[PDB]
């Protein structure tokens, strides 16, 4: 039931190889791969029992190689990556028992090239005094700006622990330059706390953005820093 899939996001340029892994909980020998697109259509890709394929998409539509070796994670791989490959690749497994359990998937994006890939810049904005005296509350705002593609995960950390209560993050990044299909993105998130909590200077707040970019394998031949997968953070301390 606790299926693992890696990486959570993948960006590739056309004509590059795209590899993703799945690892079913042990006890589950049946592994399915599905493709979900942005219109929420699912397409069955292939099915494994043990190391043997049970069913598969139409052969003339098959764009990937896939395998489930013994004592190894199931892998699925596209050799000549193309735009139309961009999607959420889902892995599921079952045990007789017909239930299928899904992993968190791999979000694959295919671009002409990796030249416009940029990591986020991150900033934290401190609550206004006006909000405090008007509501006895204090909203912090995190901005992640200038990243591409929109492959990020934002989290908030209070005194070293991840928090979920009082947090709200945009579902959709916005385009810094909507005219360009190539535009960089921005994303905002709020964390709201009581006034007294914010006013305690012993309290520490961090907004953390995990960015998914290039890996060691990608070739970077450019003047600027290779935009590798990385974490960018911004922080603030409470204030009386």
């Amino acid at each position: 039931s606790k299926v693992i899939q890696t990486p959570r996001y993948l960006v590739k340029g056309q004509g590059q190889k795209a590899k993703m892994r799945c690892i079913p909980e042990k006890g589950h020998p049946v592994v399915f791969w599905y493709q979900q697109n942005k219109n929420n259509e699912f397409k069955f890709l292939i099915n494994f029992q043990n190391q043997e394929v049970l069913q598969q998409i139409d052969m003339t539509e098959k764009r990937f190689s896939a395998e489930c070796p013994s004592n190894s994670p199931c892998s699925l791989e596209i050799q000549s990556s193309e735009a139309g490959d961009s999607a959420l690749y889902l892995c599921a497994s079952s045990l007789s028992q017909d239930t299928q359990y899904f992993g968190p998937g791999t979000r694959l994006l295919v671009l002409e090239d990796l030249k416009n890939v940029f990591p986020p810049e991150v900033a934290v904005f401190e609550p206004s005094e006006a909000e405090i005296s008007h509501t006895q509350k204090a909203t912090l705002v995190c901005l992640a700006t200038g990243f591409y593609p929109d492959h990020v995960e934002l989290s908030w950390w209070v005194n070293g622990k991840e928090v979920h209560s009082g947090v709200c993050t945009d579902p959709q990044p916005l385009k810094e330059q909507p005219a360009l299909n190539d535009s960089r993105y921005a994303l905002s998130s709020r964390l709201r706390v009581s006034a007294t909590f914010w006013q305690n200077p012993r309290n520490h707040f961090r907004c953390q953005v995990q960015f998914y970019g290039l890996s060691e394998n990608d070739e970077w031949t450019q003047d600027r820093a290779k935009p590798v997968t990385q974490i960018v953070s911004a922080e603030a301390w409470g204030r009386a």
């Binding site: 609550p127 509350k137 901005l143 005219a179």
Partner: protein, 195 residues
């Protein structure tokens, strides 16, 4: 294949409704999922017949009659997401997915206090954003019409310990908070702190 309905759905917090999936060929079993924002498909139910319960969710499946329902009652924010039914053919281990129901729960704002605040960068004082917050769910935030102005959609956060919910939207540029949200229709009584 499958016919799921509705396609989209807005429930006020605390209200309920039913999703339905008709099957146009005979199925032997159905699964229901909720896909959250993270893209995680969360298993709600598996049924080969009859009816099951699972908290505030109820599900029924009838193979002869060829449909399945999923009932949500007492809707919570956490229920938001996209629901899918998926079925196994009776005569193929692959699931066939319905088109999906996108579910939006409308938070109940108990004591609206609409306001627009200005917040400064922790690192740099000159940088700032505008926060429109505490309006009731009736309000809508319109995107900016200027290309140098950025305005997010509204977002509801839930401070659980205090049992307090609040909507907000963020705007920034490279200007004045007093007119950041002007292309939106905001409450008459909206507080604009006098900085």
């Amino acid at each position: 294949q499958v016919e799921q309905s509705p396609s989209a759905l807005s429930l006020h917090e605390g209200t309920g409704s039913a999703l339905r999936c008709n099957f146009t060929t005979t199925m032997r079993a159905v699964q229901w999922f909720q896909q959250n924002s993270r893209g995680s498909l969360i298993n709600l139910f598996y049924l080969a017949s009859g009816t099951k319960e699972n908290g505030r969710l109820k599900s029924t499946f009838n193979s002869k009659e060829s449909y399945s329902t999923l009932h949500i009652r007492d809707a919570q924010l956490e229920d938001s997401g996209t629901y899918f039914c998926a079925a196994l053919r009776a005569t193929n281990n692959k699931l066939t997915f319905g088109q999906g129901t996108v579910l939006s729960v409308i938070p109940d704002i108990q004591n609206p206090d609409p306001a627009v605040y200005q917040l400064r960068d922790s690192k740099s004082s000159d940088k700032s954003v505008c926060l429109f917050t505490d309006f009731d769910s009736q309000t809508n935030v319109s995107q900016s019409k200027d290309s140098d102005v950025y305005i997010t959609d509204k977002c509801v956060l839930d401070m659980r310990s205090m049992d307090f919910k609040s909507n907000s939207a963020v705007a920034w540029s490279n200007f004045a908070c007093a007119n950041a949200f002007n292309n939106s229709i905001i409450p008459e009584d909206t507080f604009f702190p006098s900085p």
